[model samples]
Target: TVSEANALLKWKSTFTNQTSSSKLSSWVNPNTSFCRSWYGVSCVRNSIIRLNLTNTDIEGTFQDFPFSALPNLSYVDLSMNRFSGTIPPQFGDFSKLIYFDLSINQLVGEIPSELGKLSNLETLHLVENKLNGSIPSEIGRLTKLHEIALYDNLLTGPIPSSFGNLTNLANLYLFINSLSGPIPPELGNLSSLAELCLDRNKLTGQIPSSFGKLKNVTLLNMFENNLTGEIPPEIGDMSALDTLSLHTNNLTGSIPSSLGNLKNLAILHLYLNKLTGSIPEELGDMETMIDLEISENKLTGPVPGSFGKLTKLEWLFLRDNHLSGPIPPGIANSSVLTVLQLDTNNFTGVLPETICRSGKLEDLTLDDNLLSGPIPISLTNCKSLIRARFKGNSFSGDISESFGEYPNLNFIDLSNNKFRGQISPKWEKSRKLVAFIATDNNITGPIPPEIWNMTQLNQLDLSSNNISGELPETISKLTRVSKLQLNGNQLSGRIPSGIRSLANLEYLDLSSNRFSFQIPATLDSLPRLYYMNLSRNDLDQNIPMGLTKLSQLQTLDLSHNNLDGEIPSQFTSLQNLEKLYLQHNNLSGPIPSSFSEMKSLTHVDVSHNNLEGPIPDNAAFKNARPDALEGNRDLCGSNTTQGL
Candidate 1:
């Protein structure tokens, strides 16, 4: 009795806070009777047996804790506290200890091998700490261990092969660490293991084929590691396996078709590996499969049509592979499928008409493929559709015919296609639309004014099309628009004056159109503008001096326009000008000597202008091609050809 009381008080003395509110306040004013009334102490006949001080905000080193003083102690929990320093090796003195938890603390230093002496210990929880050094192989001596949680720590070195001796271990968590080296094959001896997680580590080497012996393992996660070698086909021996996650690793070789033996498998993730070969058709036999993510691998060949048998499937991701062949129509059999990502593959043929027959598809990404033909009519009304990408393909049909109101649509890219249709007004109903790019297509008709209602737009490119008519003044309503590219169109009318207020404008290209007006001086108000191209438009006036004020301007192309005036000397203020193209303009003046001050200029062309003067002796003029200064016969300088 005296031993227990003195030990409790000795431990209590180490706390920086000994106020009345302290959790250990009851350990104060001690005596032998202290053993019976201690704060966390539970006693039978004045023999301390259990201690519970969870989440008490207690802070101290365990060195002061006298474990040997309580020989009868069977349970100790100091979890969720601020305890630091190494676990006292003296803890092994509690030979009767059955449950020990020091989790969720600031404890550091190597775990004491002396803990292996607690032969009666059943659960050892040291998770969520900074404890380093290898797990003590001596722990294997504790044959009674049923659960060992050392996860979320800095523990390194191979898992003690000695762990195989803990025949009763059912759960072992060693994830979120810097642990390296091959997983010990001996761990497969844990036939009773239910969950084994070693994810987010630097562990390498091939998965042990011995893992096949873990027949009772249900959840096995080792993702985000450097583990290599083929996934052992023996994994199919895990009849109870339900969830297997091994993604983001360097594992090679083909996926084990034997995995289909896992009748109870629910989720399988093997993405981001160097895995090759066709997806195993046997995988479709998994009736209980729900989420199958095998993306970003080197696997080739067509998707196995047998996948239609996974009626319970929900998310299927097979993008970024070399897989070819048309997606099997059987995919529609997955009535609950929500996210289907098959992009960056060689998939051809029209998309399955039943892609949305279940009306549950959400994200459908099939871009960068050989897919052709029209988007299925069912998708136009599939309200569940949120994000769809089918760009860089030969997909035909009117763009407006197979697409409609999708309140959740965020982005759509139909660039470099053959789709011919009027810009649809129905897009205004997409309350969450952000980007709508349809460049290099046969899209015709006037740009819709309703585009202004999609205020969330950040990028809108409709370039190289048959689009005509003036951009509506309402374009100003898209305050969030950052990139506006509408070049090579048949558009006519003066550029909107309201365009100046688009303060977020970073890229604006309106070249090769019929726009006729004095180039808007209002354009200078765009503070963030960097690339501005208003080239090849008919009818223009004197270059705006205000253009020189855009400090962020890097590339300015105002070439081949109809008007002219003296080159403004104020141009010297554009210190960031990198490339300037003003060739073939109507008029100019003496090449300003001040141009030499704009040192950032790398390329400059002012040929065919009514200008005359000695060329500036800057790097731009010194490195100029003879033709760059050839068209302007009036120019004569040391850096230019003098006219005879």
Candidate 2:
């Protein structure tokens, strides 16, 4: 009978516009002489009592359903469907219904309070729908209810305190909706509850201290919301807790040291919060901790050296903090250490030489630190290295000789340091360098064009150095560079015309150098150029109108050059231009009122030159700093001269 009912319901749904009527019609036999053994139709005392089609793909509205026909029915499940329309109050006629599930549907409108009349209803699931309005407090009268999942809807307002009366309720999940206001402390009265989740909602205020009373709670996650104040220390009393994630919120205060008492805890994530104070040393004692991320917060002070003892640790992320002092050597010895990210911190002193002792290191990020001295040459032998960042540090020495071949090296940044000497030809021998940044250093000599042999440099910034000699004509060998910063250096001669062929060049800064001659100007040539700064150079020529055709150009600084010409009126076409600096050059002409077409322009500095006419009075021009238009011959406007 169940098989027949399933097949009949599945087919009947195809022609029915009303969900309720289609479901009822399918439970009956069409050709049987006897009304007995035909479908998923179950009867009691020779009368139809119920129908079971839980996972059926029935569709449409419940507005015209024959609710009165299912008068004797005690349960129904039209869950997980495309059914739309609001449930009608007249449909509450099933006074004998004990269980229902119209959840995971497209239902709309307020949940009818009339459904509270079902005296025997035990489980009601109307979750994941468009239902709005406050959860009817009147539903508390359904004393026999054991499980309620009215979560994931447009429902708003505070959780009713009357839920405390549900002494027999076991499971409750009303998460991810517009539900606002404080978490009602009254929920602690549900002593019989086993699991509860109210995450990703607008519920605010401190975690209720009363929640400590949820002794039976094994899973609690209230992340990504406006919830504020400290994580109530009382949460540590949940001795049986396993996974506690309260990340991406406004929660403040230190992790409760009592949390260390949670012996069974496996995953603890409290990142991306405003949590302050040092990580409690007691947490380092967590024997079962496998994943702990407390990064991206206002957390300060030294990582409790005790954490190095978290031998069970697999992933440790303490980045983006104010942590200082030497990294405790204890961490280097952790047998289970895998990913260690301590970047963007104030950590000082030389890097610990034994960091890769475990021989299991995959990612070690120590960038943006004050550490100095030679990098541990031993690091070169750590064959397990994958992604490493030693940038923004003062570490020095001949990097040309310190680094060895890494079979899996994907990203290596030795930039912004005092490392000197020519880039070793051995660097090109490594076939996997994706980003090679050696900028802002005293490194000298020519870049081994053999680097071009790598043919995979996506970002190469060798700017601000003593690098000399012409770019190897073989430079076209690097067809993969999206960013090439050779600005602020002793680099001489013209840009290898081959570079004009880099189809994806978005950022090109050949400024502050001895680069002479005209830069190739062709929009079709550089289809993706967004920023081009060739200032403080010997380049001389007409401003490229073709640059305006670079629809993506946002900032173009060609000042401090030996060029002369009228400003290209087509500059008006750089609709996305936000910053323009064409000052300190030998040029003359009237300002383009069409420059006003640059609605996105925010800062324009065309000072120290021969120019005349009224400056554009647009917000972009008005809001500009006065120095941007100073030292000019005759530029005048409301932002400048007394009268136009």
Best by lDDT: 1
- Model 1 RMSD in Å is 2.6
Local accuracy of candidate 2 as per-residue lDDT tens digits, 268-363 = 888899988887888877778887888898887777877776778888888898888877775565777778899998888887776777678778
lDDT of 1 at 472: 76
lDDT of 2 at 247: 84
Structural similarity to truth (TM-score) of each candidate: 0.94, 0.79
For candidate 1, list the clashing residue pairs, or say none. none
Model 1 misplacement above 4 A? 17-20, 32-37, 549-551, 572-576, 593-599, 615-630, 636-644
User: Candidate 2's C-alpha lDDT?
Assistant: 0.77
Summarize candidate 1's per-residue lDDT along 433-535 as a digit string, tens digits: 8888888889898988898777788889999989998877787888888899999899898888778777788999999888887877766777788899988
Alpha-carbon error at 107 in model 1, in Å?
2.9
| 19: Cα error in model 2, Å | 12
Collision count for each candidate, in order: 0, 2
Q: How accurate locally, in lDDT, is each candidate? A: 0.87, 0.77
Question: Residue 524 of candidate 1: its Cα lDDT?
Answer: 71
In angstroms, how far off is 336's CA in candidate 1?
Answer: 1.6
